[PDB]
Design a protein around this ligand. Sequence first.
Ligand SMILES: [Mg+2]
Ligand SMILES: [Mg+2]
Ligand SMILES: [Mg+2]
Ligand SMILES: [Mg+2]
Ligand SMILES: [Mg+2]
Ligand SMILES: [Mg+2]
Ligand SMILES: [Mg+2]
Ligand SMILES: [Mg+2]
Lengths: 119, 252, 140
Amino acid sequence: MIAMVSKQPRKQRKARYAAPLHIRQKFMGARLSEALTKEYGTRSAAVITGDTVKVMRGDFKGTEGKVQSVSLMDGTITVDGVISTKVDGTEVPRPLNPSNVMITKLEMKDGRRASSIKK
Amino acid sequence: ATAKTIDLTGKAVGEVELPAVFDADYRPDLIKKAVLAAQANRLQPYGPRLYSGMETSARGWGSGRGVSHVPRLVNSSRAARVPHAKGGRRAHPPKPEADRSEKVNTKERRYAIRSAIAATTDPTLVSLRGHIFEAELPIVAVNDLESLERTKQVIEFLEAAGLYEDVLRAKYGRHIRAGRGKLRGRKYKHKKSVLIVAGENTPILKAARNLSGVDVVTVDSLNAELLAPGTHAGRLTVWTESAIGKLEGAFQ
Amino acid sequence: MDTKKFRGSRTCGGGTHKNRRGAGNRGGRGKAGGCKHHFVRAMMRGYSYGKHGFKRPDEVSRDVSIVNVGELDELASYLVEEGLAEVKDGAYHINLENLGIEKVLGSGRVTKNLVVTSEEFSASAREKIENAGGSCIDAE
RNA sequence: UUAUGCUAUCAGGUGGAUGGCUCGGCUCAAGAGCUUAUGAAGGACGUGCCAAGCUGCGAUAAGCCCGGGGUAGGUGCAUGGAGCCAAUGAACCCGGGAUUUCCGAAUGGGACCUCUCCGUAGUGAUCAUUCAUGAUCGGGAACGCUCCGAAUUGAAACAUCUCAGUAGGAGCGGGAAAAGAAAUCAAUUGAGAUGCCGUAAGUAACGGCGAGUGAAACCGGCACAGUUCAAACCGAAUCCCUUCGGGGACAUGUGGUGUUGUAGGGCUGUUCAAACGUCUGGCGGUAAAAUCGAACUUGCCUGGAACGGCAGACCAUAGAGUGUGACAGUCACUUAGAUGUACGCCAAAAGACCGGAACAUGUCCCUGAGUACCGUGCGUUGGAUAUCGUGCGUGAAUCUGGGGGGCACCAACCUCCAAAACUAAAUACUCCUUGAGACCGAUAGCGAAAUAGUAGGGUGACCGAACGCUGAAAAGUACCCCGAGAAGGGAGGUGCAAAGUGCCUGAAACCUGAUAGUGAUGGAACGAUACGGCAUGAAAGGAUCUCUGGCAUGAAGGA
RNA sequence: GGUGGCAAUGGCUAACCUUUUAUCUGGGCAGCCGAAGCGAAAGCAACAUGUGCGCAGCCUUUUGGCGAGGCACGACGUAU
Ligand SMILES: [Mg+2]
Ligand SMILES: [Mg+2]
Ligand SMILES: [Mg+2]
Ligand SMILES: [Mg+2]
Ligand SMILES: [Mg+2]
Ligand SMILES: [Mg+2]
Ligand SMILES: [Mg+2]
Ligand SMILES: [Mg+2]
């Protein structure tokens, strides 16, 4: 959250970069599928490690898969099948920004997830 | 003189007689004076700190050492406090106690504003300011425009009046400026398209508030900057009947 | 001054660079040296030495506000239009106590019958008022 | 094969300018404004699995517990190995607690000893008291009040003056403080507390009448507020503590009445009725994290990477922005707008509490003392014989009274009641909070884009830097060869691009090599002009342009 | 000084109110300057052209006429 109380770019970037962990939970959000937003009452939500998502921008457009990892600090999500191959040859997973992905399937292992999407 | 009243369909449905403010002469110089005065009056003081480069205790070494005579630190040779030493005070920097504001007398400022208002009727200057439109000036509208509460209705009215082209030009010519303006909060460089002047505070103020490059104001808050931004008269202004009826002695 | 004009001229319109140093290139600070080396400038600008006269206290001294009979005669109709005076029997009855003026001086001519009442009239103002058929009355 | 060299260009090294970016700085505005013996701020030392600096915390030691928000990851600046914590809801933010070593107001004694001695276990000093208990001590960016108090400098010297009641010092102190309800200002008749703002005004006034210094009243505004004691008369009618038994203060006066000027109050009588104020109350506002909040991520093209070009579809009380692998209203955070909100803050209705205002009355009573005033000295002031302060000396009167009305005294007239006391708001400042900017953009802006008052310097008071940038993603160079080698080099690969670990672009100075010209007979401001040799002349320069001739007209001149 | 506004029935407003957050619109007649000067002060108080010449300009038998501003007198206020 960064309001129009302040419109300066430096203030907004400082509020984003020094934002606490409870404000960085909202950084992980992404556009849902059309079906999910139609059946959940909100236009988007936050992506958790495990739910199937599809990267709709970048080198891995349309590659659905499972979010293997997420860091709240850097705001980076790593997708199964969206990786990089190093000089060693081992497949190191790639971090993609959560805005780049679009959620297709949810992950309802958390009973609190229903109240996290809305209200 | 007189104009026509155009309803929400865009067609002219009645002849309106313009007030005596509209038949004023064209004065680019007084328009420029009012514009520069308002832009100075909106300014803000700045300047360095009270002792920038000056809180040092440095003293010169005198002669006999082969170096220059500038002030240097008491325990090292590094120069300080002079405007040409590194880290030294800015010789002649801006002061926060400066008074950048200008002044125009109320009679000549009102004459400048009336000159700007007369310029809105003139098709040559309005089309000579980059405004792209096919309506016939002046664009006076019936007072139903005050009480429309959604920007789609504003879009329909501007399309009907032949003024949506300039709104589109404002939206899609709105372009990033160059230099240090972006970092200090001025990223985009904007355009002026449409000026709506309702008779009183109505929901059209919230309606066309989000139109790209479109300013809406009551007749009371009709400074000359709105009527002629950047010292150039010829803003594509949209009035109403209420603004016309509240304008007989606006600036005299 | 014009800073951008002298970028390159070194001295910036000052002649020698030994000019424009401090108070010595002006002959002291303020209006100093008015008896020794700025005597003629003191004469030219009014700084010349001396005291002359006295002052009465401002609480007792008073500067009256004046108006000439020509001004009253040639805009008395503007007084009757404005409401500061009226016309009785063809004689413009004008009181000075409400217009703020307290003395009347006979500069100019009088034509119409002005019934002027004021604090004090000059002798020629009285003469010019009474020649025209009007009258002067001292008002307390 | 001309070395040492010279000049111009090119490649590379050293280097870190320019350009671009920036979580920092500065300035202005708006809010809010004290904390500390219930042990602060500040400091020393400790504190992490591998932890050196900074930051946080204190032997429960980068933490512990509880209520609220948030919910899927967390384990600081600083995404390393191995573990740990978390769906018994952590991390994180708001609120309330716990722990909180030593010093420090530091306070049981003591400090060249941040520790040490006595332990009889700590209330050190000064104070109030019923000797139960309580107050003061230190810090706070500036502001506020009181007192003390220079010189440079200006006068073109310099002493009165100015600089200037400035700089500095001592005491006190809060969110504001001081001021404050006329012994006032006026002028012939008026106004009606104070502060601050504008103006009066560079005027009056002061002054080697030099330089300079320099108000107030009237008036227009911000904001509006009036009262309490001493005393007359009454006389313990009271006030504080408490174990509710009682104790203490007080007749050297607790308390009631009373509080002022065309005089007021008391005593005598009469008439009306009771204003403002104190307390209870919390209807309603305000109020913590925080909640919701529109509509594209559609086709082709280039691209590593689309926010872009060409087409296409929508939102706009919401086109302010920021991030996102490039220009984003429609991807995320958001934004206009609606919400929730404990403790606290304000708070009107509805009630209880004491009562206030006039009338007539008079040989009656009270109404602030080393005070008002005066002489003299000094400082200060614009204050001039006419500012205020206070050192010494003097020193009244009591309503049939006293003061003022810019030298004094007399008279008239006008105006007020001192020497006792309180009093919001308007105002001032910025540690802190938020916003904004024709501000700076890294040698600038704070000194510090903060492992910055740090490294470092000084015995000490104190002085005081430099250091920003990989890439979209580490994909941070596998394997092989040389090398003694975890150095380094080649080959090779990741990367659109080495941008190849202070790594973006990567200037010049300086250094190394190559190319062109010249060069071991040669004269110097390194160049200007003209003519030639050598090399280049792809782009951006010419194509009736370049070279060589004939013909026509040919000014000045003229064989 | 250059450019402008308003202009003897003059000009400007300052603080401040209005801010829908520093803009701006409408107010704000206190006050400053001009309007009468001379004089230390008390105090007194003037020309709304009486006259001559004459540029631009207009008219004109092209030499003259009228002539704003300009120049030179006359008259008047006050101090000595
Ligand atoms: Mg600096
Ligand atoms: Mg000279
Ligand atoms: Mg001097
Ligand atoms: Mg204290
Ligand atoms: Mg007081
Ligand atoms: Mg002084
Ligand atoms: Mg928006
Ligand atoms: Mg710096």
